[PDB]
Design a protein around this ligand. Sequence first.
Ligand SMILES: N[C@@H](CCC(=O)O)C(=O)O
Lengths: 339, 48, 48, 97, 223, 145
Amino acid sequence: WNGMIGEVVTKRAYMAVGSLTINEERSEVVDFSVPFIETGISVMVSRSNGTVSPSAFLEPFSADVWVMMFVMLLIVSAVAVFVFEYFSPVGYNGPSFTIGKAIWLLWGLVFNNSLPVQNPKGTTSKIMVSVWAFFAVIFLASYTANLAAFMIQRRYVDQVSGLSDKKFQRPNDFSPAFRFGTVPNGSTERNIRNNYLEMHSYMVKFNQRSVQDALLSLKSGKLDAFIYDAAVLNYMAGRDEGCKLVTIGSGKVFATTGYGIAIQKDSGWKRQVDLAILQLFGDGEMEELEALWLTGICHNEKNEVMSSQLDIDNMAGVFYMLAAAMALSLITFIMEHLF
Amino acid sequence: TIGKAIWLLWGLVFNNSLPVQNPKGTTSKIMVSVWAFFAVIFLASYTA
Amino acid sequence: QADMIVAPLTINNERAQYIEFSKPFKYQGLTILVKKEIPRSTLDSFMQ
Amino acid sequence: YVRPTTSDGTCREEYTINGDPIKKVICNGPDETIPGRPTVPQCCYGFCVDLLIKLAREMDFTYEVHLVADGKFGTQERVNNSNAAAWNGMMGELLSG
Amino acid sequence: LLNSGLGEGAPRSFSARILGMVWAGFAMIIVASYTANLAAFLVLRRPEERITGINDPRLRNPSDKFIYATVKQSSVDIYFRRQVELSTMYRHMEKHNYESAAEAIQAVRDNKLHAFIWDSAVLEFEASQKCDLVTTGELFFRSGFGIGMRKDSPWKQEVSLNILKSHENGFMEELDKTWVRYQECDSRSNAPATLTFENMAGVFMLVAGGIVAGIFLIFIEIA
Amino acid sequence: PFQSTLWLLVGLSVHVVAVMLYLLDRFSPFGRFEDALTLSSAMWFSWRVLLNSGLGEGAPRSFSARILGMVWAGFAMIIVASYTANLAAFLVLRRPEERITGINDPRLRNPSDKFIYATVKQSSVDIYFRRQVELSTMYRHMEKH
Ligand SMILES: N[C@@H](CCC(=O)O)C(=O)O
């Protein structure tokens, strides 16, 4: 072992501070005590795995507006056809001709006029067209207001319930490039090295140097993911110039640790020193120093992300449903041609 | 054609309302389609 | 009859002044939020 | 508000945007364009001027307004000026002469 | 007005043309105002009856009608005893408190108490289990929960190494992963389209009333 | 907010429906003249249901064009209602994406060389920053320049 910790072995440093996370190596070569602040290993970018946001058009339906619309179409078509469309005792093709035109008339009234088709003669049917048109404009107003109100809500990349995903085992999964790394010669290199051999062997080819180079790489577009300490990510992401990138979630990180001190031989104060830390929580200095030195710039409740519109992936899905209806109409055309 | 044209355009601006009729030339149908697109865009910007 | 406590107890100077304690495994704070209520109507027959 | 005297007479007479005559007083002040500090007779008018006119008409007395130049910080004797003593000549700023 | 379509002619007179133009404009005004009030109802202003953040100003001021009853005889009394800052509230919050946790958690949900002062440790479990409460975002007055042993016990270093190795391999991620169930609600205004069917049914019953009224109309017609 | 390839796909769907209306009913092969009949009429139907137009001469009798016109009108309502929702979301323009804080800006206590908080030199602000004792570490930074 070498570095600054050797100063504790050479009897040239009775006590030392800094970024010293408690773990087995520091507690193995020398002694330890209680950390004053907590931290851990975290990712600079959010937990999304490059997943595309889902569609927001079929979400308000939830397989309910189409089913209830079909049932209402059946009862409205039936009760609407057994009142004035069936006046004389006819055969089976009689009411069917009024049903085929009635469903197209109602469909024309739902989707905002579209096709006037025609109009009957009875005034009660005209009143029914007026009421159905009122339900059509009310359903349209509630559809545009509900869809817009749902669009104003949070629809950005949502966090997933998977920490160790495909990028922690096999590197050849994602076809587009996705670079990720950390600063060598540290606790993260030995922890990830002892926990994930593939991530280390695939990570040594992408190494950093400092923090400004990583910020320039993430700002330009050279680096994709960045994994480092939680405190450096809170101060780095906190002191941002545009408040674009954000950490994973809002404070839920793995591997809980903290920055502590290291002494040579347990013979002086030590214990009382720990009580000194216990005095800090008794004086409220953690809030003043936390809001004074540990603070940043982007501290305006980072919980919602909104911008412009992503890959019409939703309209592409609606187009896929239109292709499914096209195939259904093709099979229907085959069944019609077979007869 | 002006008296019916202004009423047709007024019908297209306020969302169909009355279909009235439609001529035969395809250029008038294309211009009516563009006027309907600008009409529903103006309606969307008006409601928003 | 007690040798070691597995309950997540707090760490203070009055308690740790006469006994040795280990490092905490989870740092959590105190909150004052109880519950929230969202006002809405279930029937919703407009004209309100 | 300090405004230079137009032509070679007294102040410029005007009105406000609500229908009320504005009063101006005579005030001698320097100029920032010329490197020197000459006695430039100008006309002052504003909130403190109207307040000075009100306090001047509510009490039977005469006054004379004058513009102050540079030196608006109490004059803190901190620059080493020859290794000698000093004396308070500002701070409050009211007793010059 | 109701936007209907037949197709049999058009008003040739200019008076009915201008009247129909201003009438269609009035229809667009009332439907655009109705839709605007619908969107204004969706969002809601609500942004009221919320909390403060790291320190609620209502805690420093004493209140008789809104008692902040907390857990009696616990770590909160030691925290309120070893402090010096909030000393004008320990006398008010010292009296009228419950010495049981289930009585307080059951009291704040069974309409009894106004509020409670307790850590989010049990709050996140009872809120993530009973689906009746919700936690906040900030965590003011942070504390640590450790294990205390005797000073003459040499096993504290071995157990400490077992805790460190237990947090280095990933066993804590399995415990917290299998003991923290992420259940549904996260904010008071995050999903405004989870109902819909009731809001549409409340008008559907009026549509059925219009169908019965239509049966009355055809009853007048056949008469 | 959306690339031109999306509208190109919308027009591509118009071509798919246009050739679909000709593929359904039987007619004759026609690359002989300039203007057709069922092709121009089918295009007038596609632009009639998509952009919501209205003529009055009849109605499609076949059920295939009925279902295709129903799902096509539904797609039109989806794109115009979704586009309206994108317009309202564009006019929401909610994003103060900026601010000072309130009674005490945390950026004032933290020193910064790229955003200098210059003030009036030699005035009452120097006396206020001199008689204080709280924010004393910033008097050296704000004292110069
Ligand atoms: N504290 C670490 C550096 C920060 C990190 O863990 O990334 C070390 O001294 O090696």
